[PDB]
Design a protein around this ligand. Structure first.
Ligand SMILES: *[C@@H]1O[C@H](CO[C@@H]2O[C@@H](C)[C@@H](O)[C@@H](O)[C@@H]2O)[C@@H](O[C@@H]2O[C@H](CO)[C@@H](O[C@@H]3O[C@H](CO[C@H]4O[C@H](CO)[C@@H](O)[C@H](O)[C@@H]4O[C@@H]4O[C@H](CO)[C@@H](O)[C@H](O)[C@H]4NC(C)=O)[C@@H](O)[C@H](O[C@H]4O[C@H](CO)[C@@H](O)[C@H](O)[C@@H]4O)[C@@H]3O)[C@H](O)[C@H]2NC(C)=O)[C@H](O)[C@H]1NC(C)=O
Ligand SMILES: *[C@@H]1O[C@H](CO[C@@H]2O[C@@H](C)[C@@H](O)[C@@H](O)[C@@H]2O)[C@@H](O[C@@H]2O[C@H](CO)[C@@H](O[C@@H]3O[C@H](CO[C@H]4O[C@H](CO)[C@@H](O)[C@H](O)[C@@H]4O[C@@H]4O[C@H](CO)[C@@H](O)[C@H](O)[C@H]4NC(C)=O)[C@@H](O)[C@H](O[C@H]4O[C@H](CO)[C@@H](O)[C@H](O)[C@@H]4O)[C@@H]3O)[C@H](O)[C@H]2NC(C)=O)[C@H](O)[C@H]1NC(C)=O
Ligand SMILES: [Ca+2]
Ligand SMILES: [Ca+2]
Lengths: 215, 429, 426, 215
């Protein structure tokens, strides 16, 4: 099978900048049989370029393909925030059709501090015997963030899980959830539940808390 | 526009058969120009073509070597569809499966794709989710609400708010597989704090594997100024219009309407074009005032002061901009061909050294055969020990184009040049 | 109705005289059927009759044998009162003293009694109480008053001038080791009422003539700099992270620095004293030495800045750029032939395709450094890597003589963090 | 003097039960000169029965007296919670009038757990150099209760005093105060002040606490 090696694996650039994506084939590929695809989260890949240099239907003019033989290039003349996606090259010069491993394009933007929110477990979940305490970090940039759980000022470990959204196609931010899971018994043992957030956009850590019994 | 609609269960027990169907609308399964294909995607293995069925006066079948012993792709001309059958599945078959149209014998691109089916290989039974409200315990203009969706299997769930009416500010997190072998996720939304007393918020969770739809009502209890100079090219060309731009950011909704007062060498001017307030994604406002500048006025060192007044500031914010003071010095322009060591690459660098210029305001562009070349980057001007500036511009070209003898040119626009312009050519000897 | 009202001090010094009065309402002290009596009560001795005064066309007096030598009970027909006088008291006389009507010759029952006077035999001085509110630290709530360090007993405690009686508990007093009494009075009330309703304890201590009504209620900027690229790449050099505090005012207390390596506090930073700037603000610098491999492996360095005494702080965290490192490609370019008309010519070093941007570029010739150069900052390219150019100015005579010039590059992605590329006239 | 011997010294009965109180005289007592009194806390004795068998003014029908010579009886046909009192017999058949030593009638009721409250010392008292920490056990039954003071989880001894109210005339409960006394210096040395209550009505001991500095 023909192997397609894409470079760089990740590309972080600001809107308005030119993006250059490389695809190197292990064997010569006939130009008519080299295509580029764009894949956004939760969607199938979208045909962007076919026959190495032909823009597919409805594809904006900022996207262009070039190259021949073993070296192909996808150029984004001026990046837009909605261009956040994974870009794949694909060949069918020799069967079977094969794809590259992709270049993930990340959009650079100015630093944005997260808006922090804390949610106590509902009375309904408490009756079931489990307490899930949720901390939300909303619309921040860069992706790097530190979340610390403090239960009656005592630092928590191994009882929390994090989830992060994919970069927003419009404002280029991320959001994060941190969930602290305790049994109903362990939850009723303490009063102050707090989540402490550290981020580049914050001059000092932000703490959001609630007292069990005041909810 | 051709559409592919996928159906079939994603949850398959180990050693059993995966069966999916792709219904075609807008094209025929018997098309002599198309190949009806299946491609899977998994983290690590990436996109992997599985095979195709296609009609060319006879039905043909082609499969990837790795799955050939277990796969069948069958067309159905009565229902205009095609299926995927993958026998004896193992956890290695867990992936998102797509059907796709490979079209046009001359190009064979995949232009139309199905929505994808998440396939999970597991002996575990299907379990519908439980949904709990996320509401604050007890100043701030925006509030967050949400739903915790948990104890379900397999993935996926679809979450909506107010039956799909509420989409703005919604964040549905990726699910995490818990130690119980069940998934959990939260869906959140930010809303105006004022609306909490009158407006209702309900999350709707759809879990197609268990055929359940769950509803859960969620019940609850500055400015900065930036002043930009004109672009160097604009000031040097009489056919271009130079302008100074005053930008105000972090304008609040509560305290809007900004006052823009300009001063050319201290003298107030009233020809600026102020654009209306534009709401930003971060809920602030941005206001822009543009002042057309006279070419000679900028070049002669006139000062442009922007005064901004708003309720957010007690003392009115002022910014002043002007061209650098000092005797203008003519830039020397030299073109350098690629190094012989770079000739082993498919792409080579064409260099333009621009030095001895003052002030640092300059424009550098590249062209070939009377057309602009855009695959270049120019360094910022750098201060030399004699008080003048230098920079380099690098144009990346295909080695073939350079070897063919194509003439490339570096154009430079600076105030100290004759007619504010010079061009230097570079071609293979 | 018939009522008896007692008065007189209860505190009597040993060997001195107890004097109490009983005022009658609704009957006459001269009643021919009544006997105006005094009875005392103490734990252990119980109820003990002391005596009576009674009029039967003449005033008569009858006393208990035990107190006969020290007691007098005198009627007062002008005020309708009768007294008790008990001389030479001892601690055995400590008791509650009641006046009472013994009535009807056929039955002689005690149907009407005074309220009682607590009599304490002690040489100790009278002391008024100190009253403190009892309120929680943070459906029903409890409030109270602590009535402490008084002598003798009793005190009367009421709530809201007697309006609040439900849920009130006034505890018996306890005699402390100091010889002074202490007690608490509490009340439970609806928690909802706490915001609108007032609660006041009224403490009366007649011996000290005290009545207490107690209401029961319940700048600078920081910049954090990474090490110099050459310092992290040479084991003989010392890389350091620099924390700079600007816009410190003269009157500001000492700037304190706390440093952390992946969250772990370190104590080896070297903090320099405050320095005044030309704009009259002060600048303070703290320098932390870092280990070459820790920086290159992506360890996080945190500087926390605060002022001595004050609780607020500013924090900054730094670490190496995230992303895959890429080896720079180094190319030397001779002067343009058009520049050969000058006494000095430019030798160019193109360094491209590197990641991260942290790099050091120098020049040499004949084993000696060449210092007449300038290097552009790294420039981000369309492929996410960086490039730069370095320009060494040399005398044309030196270039034409065939001297070999070298561009040296130090970068983490190079073998041994070093590469050199030569350039000479050929 | 004539001695009156009352039995039993204490009587614990539920409301609705019959109460039989005996008074035995050391010499014969003329029936017209034998009386019974009821004494409630903080009050003078109330005439209940005179002339051995006559109910005094305003006395309920459940109270009756009987006997002659040296043996007299006070009967409460059906005990009421407000009947909690000490009952005394008295003679004046021969001078001087004498009283019995009394029978204390206690009221039995269902078990009631105490409601526990903790009070930190006031700022006003702290200024004077003494810290009095008060623990309240409200409206409980039976009387038996254990109160333990813990200062920074360390058990206290010899620095606390207890005080109990008399049985409530309506609900037959008791209330208790426990006062911990420390100097201002010893008080500022520690943070967690706690009172631990053990009672028949509590499944497990109840702890009420406060942190000094949060008040
Ligand atoms: C709420 O959101 C606002 C909008 O943000 C934008 O949209 C979101 C969705 C993201 O995509 C963001 O990345 C995006 O910016 C924020 O506004 C931004 O505020 C910051 C300050 O906090 C501003 O930063 C300043 O930027 C100057 C440079 O600005 C030019 O370049 C930017 C790209 O790099 C571009 O976005 C700008 O539009 C601007 O572009 C130039 O415009 C002129 C005039 O039209 C043209 O002639 C030029 O050709 C354009 N050039 C280019 C390259 O396109 C910096 O110069 C400035 O730095 C200076 O001051 C600081 C001190 O503040 C010094 O330290 C420094 O040395 C220097 O002197 C500063 O960084 C940014 O410009 C704002 N963005 C816009 C579009 O106006 C709000 O901040 C945010 N609020 C909150 C609370 O989150
Ligand atoms: C009162 O005066 C103070 C002193 O000013 C100095 O002296 C006067 C006489 C003038 O000559 C000044 O130009 C000179 O700065 C002022 O302090 C300065 O405050 C500003 C903020 O208001 C600081 O700006 C920040 O600078 C960062 C870069 O700083 C490096 O580079 C400077 C030269 O470009 C250099 O002066 C600095 O010393 C520093 O140098 C590095 O130091 C490290 C550690 O020792 C070395 O390892 C490096 O090799 C040095 N590198 C070089 C090139 O020499 C910026 O990174 C920073 O920007 C970031 O944040 C802003 C937001 O604030 C973003 O917008 C931006 O995009 C970016 O992310 C910022 O611009 C400046 O550094 C301070 N100067 C010093 C020397 O500390 C006071 O401000 C002034 N007060 C008032 C009220 O006027
Ligand atoms: Ca077709
Ligand atoms: Ca390395």
């Amino acid at each position: 099978d023909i192997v397609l090696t894409q470079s760089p694996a990740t590309l972080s650039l600001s809107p308005g900048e030119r993006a250059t994506l490389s695809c190197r084939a292990s064997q010569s590929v006939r130009s008519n049989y080299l295509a580029w695809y764009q894949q956004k989260p939760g969607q199938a890949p979208r045909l962007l370029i076919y026959g190495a240099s032909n823009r597919a239907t409805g594809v904006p003019a900022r996207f262009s393909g070039s190259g021949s033989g073993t070296d192909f290039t996808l150029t984004i003349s001026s990046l837009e925030p909605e261009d956040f996606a994974v870009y794949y090259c694909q060949q069918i010069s020799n069967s079977p059709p094969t794809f590259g491993q992709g270049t993930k394009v990340e959009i650079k933007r100015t630093v944005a501090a997260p808006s922090v929110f804390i949610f106590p477990p509902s009375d309904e979940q408490l009756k079931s015997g489990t307490a899930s305490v949720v901390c939300l970090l909303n619309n921040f940039y860069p992706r790097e963030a530190k979340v610390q759980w403090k239960v009656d000022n005592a630092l928590q470990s191994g009882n929390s899980q994090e989830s992060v959204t994919e970069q927003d196609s419009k404002d280029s931010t991320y959001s994060l959830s941190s969930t602290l899971t305790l049994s109903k018994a362990d939850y009723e043992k303490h009063k102050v539940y707090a989540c402490e957030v550290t981020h580049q956009g914050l001059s000092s850590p932000v703490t959001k808390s609630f007292n069990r019994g005041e909810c | 526009q051709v559409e592919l609609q996928q159906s079939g269960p994603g949850l398959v027990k180990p050693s059993q058969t995966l069966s999916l169907t792709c219904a075609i609308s807008g094209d025929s399964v018997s098309s002599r120009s198309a190949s009806w294909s299946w491609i899977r995607q998994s983290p690590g293995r990436g996109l992997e073509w599985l095979g195709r069925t296609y009609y060319r006066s006879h039905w043909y079948y082609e499969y990837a070597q790795s799955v050939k012993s277990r796969i069948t792709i069958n067309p159905d001309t009565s229902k205009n569809q095609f299926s995927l059958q993958l026998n004896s599945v193992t956890p290695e078959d867990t992936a998102v499966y797509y059907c796709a149209r490979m079209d046009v014998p001359s190009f064979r691109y995949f232009d139309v794709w199905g929505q994808g089916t998440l396939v999970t290989v597991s002996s575990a039974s299907t379990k519908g989710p439980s949904v709990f409200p996320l509401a604050p315990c007890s100043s701030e203009s925006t509030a967050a609400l949400g739903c915790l969706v948990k104890d379900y299997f397999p993935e996926p769930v679809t979450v909506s708010w107010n039956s799909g009416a509420l989409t703005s500010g919604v964040h549905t997190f990726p699910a995490v597989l818990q130690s119980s072998g069940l998934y959990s996720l939260s869906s959140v939304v930010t809303v105006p704090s004022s609306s909490l007393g009158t407006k209702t918020y309900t999350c709707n969770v759809d879990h197609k594997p268990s055929n359940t739809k769950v509803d859960k009502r969620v019940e609850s209890k500055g400015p900065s100024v930036f002043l930009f100079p004109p672009k160097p090219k604009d000031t040097l060309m009489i056919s271009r219009t130079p302008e100074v731009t005053c930008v105000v950011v972090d304008v609040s909704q509560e305290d809007p309407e900004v006052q823009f007062n300009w001063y050319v060498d201290g003298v107030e001017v009233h020809n600026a074009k102020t654009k209306p307030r534009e709401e930003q994604f971060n809920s602030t406002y941005r206001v822009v005032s543009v002042l057309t500048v006279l070419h000679q006025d900028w070049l002669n060192g006139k000062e442009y002061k922007c005064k901004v007044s708003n309720k957010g500031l007690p003392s009115s914010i002022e910014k002043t901009i002007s061209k650098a003071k000092g005797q203008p010095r003519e830039p020397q322009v030299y073109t350098l061909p690629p190094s012989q060591e770079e000739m082993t690459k498919n792409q080579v660098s064409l260099t333009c050294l621009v030095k001895g210029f003052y002030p640092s305001d300059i424009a550098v562009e590249w062209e070939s055969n009377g057309q602009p070349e855009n695959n270049y980057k120019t360094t910022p001007p750098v201060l030399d020990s004699d008080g003048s500036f230098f920079l380099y511009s690098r144009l990346t070209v295909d080695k073939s184009r350079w070897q063919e003898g194509n003439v490339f040119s570096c154009s430079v626009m600076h105030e100290a040049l004759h007619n504010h312009y010079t061009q230097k050519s570079l071609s293979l000897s």
